[PDB]
Structures are given as structure tokens and as C-alpha cells.
Subunit: 307 residues, 5 copies
């Protein structure tokens, strides 16, 4: 079994696609193994780049194809090199930008955490083994984080493993295990923006919706609530047009629904206080009670959301 | 006729385009047939990848071109391999990401069901037969379903068939039948998001619009209804800007129209009760009747929507 | 002059770009002519695909370049084959997806009609003639039409002609005429969606805008009209954000302008009735007259729109 | 110096990008020069297309590379031919679609005028001269203009000139001047759509905003003005979501700002009339004066906008 | 060590991607070094373009690969030439369009400043040195600046340095330092558009929001504030749909938050004055005091924002 050691340099992780559960990775990938010794110009290692790389393969050079398992579409490979050492070593180095998929959960949206993963396997060889995997996620850890959108919690974890494929031919007795490198990078989203520009104004709106009870007339209380209803819809839209459409409701989307509920419950209470008492009494003990109880019931129900 | 057996591995189905009736499919495709025996290095099967694959075809190797019938534009083929066995077997393995089209019906939008299909035929050969089709849709079936946007009901169905092309040349007496593999995967949309963030708020709005009759004055009743009218339009827009523009009205689009109708019918009733009775009587038996009857008539018409 | 007969199979026409006046066409293109007889393996016609096609051209095989005149950018050609017959026939078959342009008029938007055209010419040869053009637009004609966005009125019409290019070199005495195939497919847009989700609610809004006269006070009439004005703007936006921005006003855009006019004319009449009569008389004979005349004047002006 | 004559056929100019100051040009490009005489099949001119063009360059044929100076990214070249004449003439013909940049000013937005320019230079040769430039902008000039988005005022102007590059090597004594063809096509935007769907409704709204003074109470006048304030914001948005974001304010963008100013100035006057006079007099001579003067001051300031 | 001198011509910098922190650069890149002397046709320098460049590399010509370190994906290379001098000089000239990344701060949005950087390194050689870097940012400096979106303060700065890579093989004793060219261009955003179309109208709205205190009744004061609240939401959306979603709050985003606060603070004060005084006194000394103090407190807090 050929011993192949890879090294992965990560420059930039960006472009998270929430609907497709994908993200972009730009960086370099190096792989090194030892083969037959070779006659090289002089005795220095030979450097072969780009189009000339295919030429050595035509003359018989073995360069195994390594596939990104979780890549979504063929990645963009920039420059690529072959390092031919006289003692048999071979080092392949290539710059790449690719889009990768992983199971990503966004239910706890502004405060969510994710891990960007890479999965690397040889495309056709099981009789060749990934020897050791060193990844260098050299991006700032303490420089610009409150400024950046994602916070990388710690240096990446590596794990080389063996994957068992069952459905093969009928001629393979036992060589159906492939070497797989699995890289994991944990990251947490920066909630700062969504707090100030989304959650807070919605709170102010939802809070101000409770001040509908401080109106004196019943007509004032019911009519105004319809203008409040419109405000939530308009704010529900402002949110959606910028955030997007996930398959599941988010925290902000739950707050949006809560705004709808608070206002509709106020409409019911406002109508209730009018026609609840016999002979046209306006039940002022309710309008004044829920004048502060309606804010409190919303805070009490909100704490069970974190159950 | 050459016996060709294919295997299709499906990694990911995503990116449904409702207007174009298309969807993205990432996976692998394997095809195996038996040809002339061959001298191989030693006696082990030879592996040929990527650029070297074309070289064997230049020297005379027969590799038939298989086309995805329902593909929309050339698919992205990642790595591809040739497995050359000494006893004559040939295994072609290729990673692909492609967009496929199918007749897709979206009238019952949030609750619609679809099937993603793949259609594979030899491009030029009818004297070559697809022998058996095994597809492995190994994606979760009981892991993350309430979390994902689509729910795969069951394992995919396969069907090898014969397609008759009429309009050919004039030299083909009887060889105008091509082997076609047709794969079908059934899936149902996860309605969770559209229920909570779209259908529910619209219900709350449509319901609250009926509380206009609980206003005491006629001026109050008619003026407020115009604010309700604006609210539906604003909600119609919140919906449309996020969902899109389908060629046919959806379930949600019908509810929006129902909202418009309920409000416009309320405007008619509110004006009617005012000027229906002689000498300016306000017909209070109407405003109080439809105070609860207007909610009931909407529920009665909604049940005939499912007729 | 070489006799070349072409066949065009049309699988799918989609993605109309209203601003760029373009549309997408997926299908196949076949071309057949008779050349020198040839020695083939055995005596059966030889099949040459994809990369192997260029090789025969290197060894001298004449394969003319046919250009889509109205194509917008190089189209995406999938698989391509050459059928080499021993008696001299040559059949070129290629799958393609391309974007084509034509003069498209959208002034009668929801009810507009269009024709999708294809124009095919030899790129460099005038001494070679397109012999006959058979196109197979085998898409449903009576299956799913009320469901699809476009309705194909009938099977495609074809027209082979000769195009005279003037500005050529100085050495061409008379060979400046090229053979051109022109395929035309007429289609009418399905107005269902735009009627129910756009035209109807606008009518309801415009109609309800006339109910401003059923208010009793002048203050009510003028103040409410400002909320109606806002409602049209909000609806004008809902329309535009989903449809788009054409270079010319559409039917829907004219109705929107009619909404602006109806409301603005109501403001004038509402203000007129107040200060028209001497000593502050409110001219109640006007508010009651245009209470129904304003709906009628809009219906009368709408009929002259179809003049 | 080699004498090269070019001809540029322009089929379609579309896709203006206001922010990037670019536009799309589809057409053909022809170049002709006279070189060494040549032995050709028979004695007829030889036609070489697409992949075969590169082959003649390998055997030594001189085909100069012509670059579009103001192109943004490599253009999409469709079919290309070589016409090899026996007397030494060589004609290169290629279809192309490319994006070109020019300084484009949009300050007078609906009524702006632009010129789409093409700049063509040899990439590496200064000892080779562009002999004459004929461009054929055969697009309708009197057919569909009120229907199309841009109006071409007249046939294009051509200009071959000499460009002096300074910063070269140290070995070039006098050969640092390159031949440049400069084609200019003047075009004016079709304002019809923006007048009817943008400028006119804004005028109606801005006009109707002045009718706030026809309200009798002070409370009516100030409260309504806030609804007018909201209406302008909604209309400012309807405009922007369809037009876009230019680096400078447009004519329409100025009208929007004028709407904001008129309403805010109205708020000031409405509040002014209330508390300007001692002992609570409402200064009715102001409300009735600016009832018509406020429309007049807006027209007077609007005329100085064209100073 | 080989002496390589580069020259970079920058034609156009556009397409700032605020979320991805990237920008597009179109221009040329030239590199010159001296190698072995060579026999050339006649004795003039030989010009090799495009496809022919690869051919000399096959026969042994050394052309090092230079990588853009901060490029995001492989850039679009237009025409490229090789200048082969007989005395050993070699000049490589290539047109390119690429997207580059740099750390970009947008916190002070309309008034922010940025620098567009290029980073150029040899891909595989450390025993080869970038000799001198001349970049020609010949774009207007005093022509169109108030018209363009960005203002380039001055000509670009250059910086050749040495980059030390640690994690290399085990056979490199001391050759782990690579030459890096770093070009920097400073630019300031044109705030004109954002001042007139965003900052000014928001100021008027926030200012006009303070005129709610000039209403006489308490019912008037609270009801109108809900219409003001909606106005901020509508304007918050107008802003966002055109600007986008940055990871951090901007100056404009802060003003939006200030608008919500002023209105929400107004709601509290309006309700306070009603129920603050015993026996139902309306505390008119408060409504008139903050009639001007509320504008002043907003101006007083706004100056501490620039702290």
C-alpha cells in the first residue's frame, strides 16, 4: 500500500448557502508519497507545473486522483505543481476553490453554530493509504472576530478513517475499504448584526403594540390595533426580504409569529372588554390589568421557548 | 447486442426550480459490460482516469456515450475512471452534478408532492442493451426529515424499457428501438415553514378582518376596512417576493384572493347595512348577525375548495 | 452544390427574457448529406462520438459549420455524433441548449402572443444548400396546457430561403447568397395566473376606491382617499417586484395608472363638492351622483382602451 | 508594415449595466490582409474553421491576435473561419459576444444619452497597421424604435488613430505606436416607461399631497401629513427596487427628494399657521394662501432645477 | 537567483462585494527576465501568442507560474504573448480579469475608506526573485470623481517583500522564503448618492416624527406615533432592499435604530404625560417642553456617536 500524506491550507471560508447547505472553501492542497527513484536534471528535484503535469502522466507517471466526497460540482483548480524528487518522493501542490456540502442546522438562526467539513478519498484506489493529514487553518483567531460574520472556535480537528463500500462487483473478495480524511472546523455566527437591526426593532414594535391598551376609547383601541397588525406584516417582510426562506422557522421568524399572536390576542381582549359585561359596561379593570399583564404574559411565555 | 448494466448513486437532490420545472442531482454513475479480453500489466485490472481515458479511445477502445435524456444543459462530470479487467469486463465510473427536468405540478403548493426522475439512454447505439439498473438512493430515510425541505417517501423505483423512434433515415429496416433506463424518486415537500410563517399569519389577518363589524359607527366600520384592504396587499407582497411567480395560482395564492374577497365583501355589507333600511335605519340586526356569520360563511366556502 | 438536409428536435422552450427579448431552446439538431463513398469497418455504418469527431476532421473529413444566426452567445452542445455511411451519406447529430433572440412585443402583456424563431445558416459556405428542413416540435398540444405557462398554437412552420449579403470582398462576382432555414413556433401566454392574482385584486381595490363617496363627512372623504392613494402605490409595487421592468407600459401597468387617476380624480371631486357652492353648501347632489357615476365613467373609459 | 482592413457587424446591443458602466455587443468581426501567395486545393480559396484554424498557425501561418481594449473579460467567440486566398489575401471571420466598458453618465436618468464604443488594437504588433474600418450597424433605424429600449440616432462613426505607449522596455527606439480603431454608436434612452409608470404617478402623489391644506381642522392637517410622509417612502421604495442604485442622484431621485421636502415643508407651515398668531388664532389667511401657493412654489423651484 | 521584473497595468476596479470582501480587477500584467541567448528568425525578437506559448514550454522553455495570492478563483486571462529576445530577455504580457479578496471594513458605511490590494508570488520557485515592481494605475485622478462611485486618493504603492513559509517538507534546509509583490490602491466611497437619497430623507422623517407633540389631544398624539412607527419600518425596508446585509451595523443602520428609538421614546413620553399627574392632569408643561427638547436630546446623543 502506497503511503500518501496530505496537507491542506485553508485561506478563506465564505458564501454559506443556507438552502443548499453548502459553503465555499478557497485554499491549497498538498500530497506527498514515495515512489521509484528517478533521474532528474542534475540531481535537484524537478518542478513541473500545469499543462506539463499531464505530459509526465502520458509517459507513465502515476498521479492518483483524489476526490472531495462532499464537493458540490467540480472545483476550480488554479495553479498546480508536481515536485519530483530523485529519491522517489513526489509532492503535488494545487490551489483550489470549491463548494462543499454538509448537514447544517439553522433552527437557532442568529445564535446558531456550524462546522465546515471536508472529506477526502482516493477516487479509484483502496490499495493506497492516506498516511497522515495535517491541515493549517491559519486564519485569524484573535484579530477581527467581532467584525467578521463567523467565529472559528478552535483549530481544526483531523481524522483519517476507513470507509466500507458494499455494493461493488463480484470479483472483489476483501479490497473494498478506502482511506478517508475528514477535516472539521467549528464556527459560530456573529449575532451582532441580527440583534441590532432585526431583533431589537421587532422588540420595540412588539412592546409598543401593548401600549394599545393605554387608549381611552374602545374605538381607538380596536382601530389602532389594525394599524399595528399592518406594521408586523411590513416588518415580517423587511425581515424575509433580507434573510431568506429556510425550510424551517427561525428564532426571528418565531418572534415574527409572536408579534402576530400578541396583536391578535390584543384584538380579542379589546373586543372582549367591550361586550363582556352586561348592560354595556366597558370592564375598565381588564384594560388596566392587561395594560401591564399583556407585556408580562408575553415575557412569561417567552421563557418556555428555551425549555 | 452488448449487455450493459448501470448503477446510479444519488448523493443529493436540491435546487428545485419551480418556473423551469428542474432540479439538481449530484452523484455517481457506473456502467459495466464485457468486451474482448485484454493484456494488462501483470494480471491485475488496470485503472485509467480523466485525461488518460481519452487516450484508450484514440487507440480504439469502445466506450459508448450515455446521455441523460431529461438533463438541462451539459452536466458537470467530476472525476471519471475506467476499470479494465483482463477477462473482458469494463467498468466506467464517473461523478456528476446535473440539472434535470420533469413535468412538475405545483397547484397544491405547500402540500404538493413530486417525483424526481432520471432518464438514461445510449446516444448512438440501439444494438446495445441496458441489462439491469441498480440505483442506490442512500440518503436519510429516518434521520432528518422534519428538518429537511423534502421528504423522500421510499426507495427509488427502476424500469428498463424500449423507446421507439420513428423519424429516422431510410436505411433502418428495424433497428429503431433504444434501451432506456427510467429512475423515479418520490418526495413530498416539508410544509412546516409555510404553515407557521405564511398560512398562519394570513389566517390571523383574515380572521381579524372580520372584527370590523364589532365597531359601533358606520364611519368606523368602512374607514377601517380600507386599512384592512392595504394589509392584505402588503401581505400578498410579503408572500410573493419570497415565494415567486408560478404560472398557476397556488393554495396560498387562493387564500390571498380569499382575503381580498372577504374584505371586499365586508365593504359591501358595511355599506349595505347603512343604506338598506328606509329613513336611515342602520339595520343593527345585520351588523350583529354577520359579526359571527361572516366568519362562518368563509369557513363554509373553504370546505368546498377541497371538493 | 452540396445537398444538406437538417432535422431539428425541440424538447423544451423556456426562460423567456422580456427585457433582452430572448428565450431558451433545448433539443437536438441533425444534418445529413452525401459525400464520397468510404471504407468502413465491415460494411456497417460507423459511429463516431464527441472527441473522436475532431480526429476525422484532422484526417480530412469535411464537416461544415452551421451557425444559429439569432443565437445569443455560444450554445451548450452536449453529446455529438457522426454517422458515416459506406455509400457516402454522413449524418451529424448533436444535442444543444442555446439562447435565441427575436423581436418580441409585450405591450398586451397578460394576453400577448409571440413566436419563437430559429435561424440556421452555413457559416462559411454559399456553394452548399440546405435541402429540406423537418422539425419535430413534439411537446404536448392537448395534455397540459391550462397548467403550462405557454400554449403552442400549432406545429412549427419552416421556411428555407436565400439571404443576399452585399458587403463582401472584391473577388466575388455572383456567389454571395447563403441558404437559411427559418423555423417559427407561435405561442400564446397563459393569462390565468395574472388574472386571478394581479388583475382581479386591482379591480377590487379600484372598485372599493369608489366607495369613498359613501362616507358622510367631507373630512372622512378626503382623509380616507389618502389611504387609498397609498394602497395603489403598495399594489403598484407588488406588481412590479414580481413582473419586472419592461421598456413599455403593459396592460397591468395601465390599470395601475388608472388606479392612480381614479383616486386622484376622486380627490378633486371630493374637494370640488365642498367649495363649489356659495355660502358653504356641500353639493350633495354630486357626491350621490358620482357615487355610481364614478364607477361608470371608469367602465366607459376602459372600453375606449381597446379602440 | 502589414495592411489589415477590418469590418465589424453589430447585430445586437443590450444589457447595459449602470453600476459597472458596461453593455453587451453581439456581432461578427472580419479582418483581411495580403501575405505570401500560396498553393491551395485546385485554385479556389480554402475555408478553415474552428479547431482547424489553430492547425495552420502551428505550421507557421501568421494570424495576428486582435484585442478589444475596452472589453471586460475574455469575450465569447462562436464560429470562426479562415479564408485563405491563393494570391496572398487572408480573411479571418468570427462571431463574438462580449461585454465592453465606457464612461457612461446617468445623471439625467430617464432622458440620458450614451454612446457605446468599441476599441480594437493589435495585441503585440506595432509594425502592422489597420488600413480601413467599415462597420455595419444594420439594426432598424425606422422600424421599431418607440417599442425598443434604446434609440440609435445615426449610423456609427469610425476613427483609426495612433496611440502612444510610453512605459515599455529599454530596447524600443521608435516603435511604440499602435494602430487603434474606435467605433462610436450614439443612443438615447426611451423615456416612455419611466414617464407613465414612475414620473406621472409621482406627480399625482406630489400634487395630491398639497390637498392637505383643504382640510378644515388643524388635527386633520397634521395627522394626514404623516400618512403622506409614509406614502412618499413607499413610492421611493417602489422606484428603487425596480431601477437600482446608481452612484449619483438621478432626475427621478431628485423628484423623490422634492416629495419629501414638499411634505416636510407642509408639516412646518401647518404647524406654523397654528401657533404663529397670538391668543390661538389659526391664521386662516395662510392655509388658504398656500392652498394654491404651495403648488406654485414647487413649480417655481422645479424650473430652476434646469438652470 | 533569476531576476524577474514585473509591470502591472490596472484598467478598471469595480464590483465591490461587501459580504464576500472581494473586488474585480481588469488589466494587464507584464514580467521580464533574462535567460539563455537564443537564435531567432532573422535577428529580431520573436512574438509568440496564445496557443503557441504552450508549444515553446513543451520544447523546454522555462516560464514560471506566478500566482495571485489573494485571488478568489482562477482569473480570466485574455490574450497573452511571449517576447523572446535574441540576447536572452523574455517578456511575458497578459490581459486578465480577476476577483481579489482583502480585509475590508464597512462600519462607517457611506463615509468608509478601503484599499484594493494585489498579492503576487511565484507559485513554485523560491530561488527566483522579483526584481522591481512598477504598477501604472492610469485611471483618472482629476477628471470624473464626483461622478464615479469611488475616489482614488493617489497612485498605487508597491511593496516587494519576503514571505517565510514554515510547514514545508523535511529536505529544505533554508530555501523556504518566497518573493511577494503587494500592490495597494487607496479609495474612498462617493457618499453623494447615499446622502441625498438615504441620509437626508431619514433626517426629515426622524425630524417630522418629533412634530407629533404639536398635536393637541392625547388620542391624537399616541395614534399618530403608530403611523410614525410604521413609517420607520417602511423606510428601514427601503434602505435594506437596496443596500444589502452586512455582518455589522453601518452608519445608516444606526440612524435607522435611532429612528425607532426616538419614536419609541416618544410613545413613552406621550403616555407618561397623560397618567403622570394626579387626578387626570395632562401635564401640559411636558408636552410643550419636549416639543423642542426631543429634537435636542436626539442631537445631543448623536454627537456622542462620533466619540
Amino acid at each position: 500500500p502506497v503511503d500518501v500524506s496530505v496537507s491542506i491550507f485553508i485561506n478563506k471560508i465564505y458564501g454559506v448557502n443556507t438552502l443548499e447547505q453548502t459553503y465555499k472553501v478557497d485554499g491549497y492542497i498538498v500530497a506527498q508519497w514515495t515512489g521509484k527513484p528517478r533521474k532528474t536534471p542534475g540531481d535537484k528535484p524537478l518542478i513541473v507545473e500545469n499543462t506539463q503535469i499531464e505530459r509526465w502522466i502520458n509517459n507513465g507517471l502515476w498521479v492518483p486522483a483524489l476526490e472531495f466526497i462532499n464537493v458540490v460540482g467540480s472545483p476550480d483548480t488554479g495553479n498546480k505543481r508536481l515536485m519530483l524528487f530523485p529519491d522517489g518522493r513526489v509532492i503535488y501542490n494545487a490551489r483550489f476553490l470549491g463548494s462543499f456540502s454538509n448537514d447544517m442546522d439553522f433552527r437557532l438562526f442568529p445564535f446558531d453554530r456550524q462546522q465546515f467539513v471536508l472529506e477526502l478519498e482516493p477516487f479509484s484506489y483502496n490499495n493506497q493509504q492516506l498516511r497522515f493529514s495535517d491541515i493549517q487553518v491559519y486564519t485569524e483567531n484573535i484579530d477581527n472576530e467581532e467584525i467578521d460574520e463567523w467565529w472559528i472556535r478552535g483549530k481544526a480537528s483531523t481524522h483519517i478513517s476507513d470507509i466500507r463500500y458494499d455494493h461493488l462487483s463480484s470479483v472483489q473478495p476483501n479490497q473494498n475499504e478506502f482511506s478517508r480524511i475528514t477535516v472539521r472546523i467549528d464556527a459560530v455566527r456573529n449575532p451582532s448584526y441580527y440583534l441590532w437591526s432585526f431583533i431589537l426593532p421587532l422588540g420595540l414594535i412588539i412592546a409598543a403594540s401593548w401600549s394599545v391598551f393605554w387608549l381611552e376609547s374602545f374605538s381607538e383601541r380596536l382601530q389602532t390595533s389594525f394599524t399595528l397588525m399592518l406594521t408586523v406584516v411590513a416588518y415580517a417582510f423587511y425581515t424575509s426580504n433580507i434573510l431568506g426562506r429556510l425550510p424551517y422557522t427561525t428564532v426571528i421568524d418565531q418572534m415574527i409569529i409572536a408579534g402576530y399572536g400578541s396583536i391578535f390576542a390584543a384584538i380579542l381582549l379589546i373586543i372582549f372588554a367591550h361586550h363582556r359585561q352586561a348592560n354595556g359596561v366597558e370592564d375598565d379593570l381588564l384594560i388596566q390589568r392587561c395594560r401591564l399583564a399583556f407585556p408580562l404574559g408575553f415575557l412569561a411565555i417567552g421563557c418556555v421557548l428555551v425549555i
